[PDB]
Copies of this chain bind each other. A is one copy, B any other.
Amino acid sequence: ATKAVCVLKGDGPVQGIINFEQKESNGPVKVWGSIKGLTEGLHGFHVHEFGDNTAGCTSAGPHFNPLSRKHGGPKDEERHVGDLGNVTADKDGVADVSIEDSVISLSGDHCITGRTLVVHEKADDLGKGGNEESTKTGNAGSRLACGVIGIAQ
C-alpha cells in the first residue's frame, strides 16, 4: 500500500482523521490531517501495537516497538517505531497534523497498517522527563482517541 487512513474516535470530544502517504516503499511516510476536541498545547501521538479496540483504546496495548528500543522523540535514534512525538492543538482545541517520518512504514516489518494510532492526554516528554516512565512511554497520559490504521484508496 502507498495510502492509509485512521479515523480517531474516543469516549469524549476527541475526534480526527489522519492520512498517510508513502509513494516510495523505502522513503518517508507523510502523516497529515486534523484532530479537534483537545486541550490547548501538546499531545502525544503514537502508534501502538495492536489494531484491537475490543475494550476501547487500552486494548491497542504498548507502543509499536518491534526493535525493542527505548522511548524517544521521533528524531531520536533511540526510539520506538511508533514514537511519533507530539501534535499541537491551538486555543480552539484543533491540532493540524503535518509529520514526515522515515521510521514507520506502510509495508514490511515496520508496517503500521492494522495497528492503532493514539492521541494521548498530555505532552510526550520525548524520553527526557526525568523518571522511569519517561523512557518507556513518554508520560503522555491516557488515550483520548484512537483508530486502527487502514488501507486507504
Mark A residues whose CB is within 8 Å of B.
1, 4-5, 7, 17, 49-54, 61, 113-116, 147-153
Chain B proximity of A148: nearest CB distance (Å) = 4
Is the CB–CB distance between A150 and B7 below 8 Å? no
The binding surface of chain A is classed by DSSP as: loop
Is the CB–CB distance between B5 and A150 below 8 Å? no
- CA of A52 to CA of B51, assembled, Å: 14
Is the CB–CB distance between A114 and B4 below 8 Å? yes
Is the CB–CB distance between A150 and B152 below 8 Å? no
Chain B proximity of A117: nearest CB distance (Å) = 11
- CA of A86 to CA of B5, assembled, Å: 28
- CA of A7 to CA of B116, assembled, Å: 13
For this complex, 30 residue pairs linking A to B, each with C-beta atoms less than 8 Å apart, are: A1-B114, A4-B51, A4-B114, A5-B50, A5-B51, A5-B52, A7-B52, A7-B54, A49-B151, A49-B153, A50-B150, A50-B151, A50-B152, A50-B153, A51-B148, A51-B151, A51-B152, A52-B150, A52-B152, A61-B153, A114-B114, A114-B149, A114-B150, A114-B151, A115-B150, A115-B151, A147-B148, A148-B148, A148-B149, A148-B150
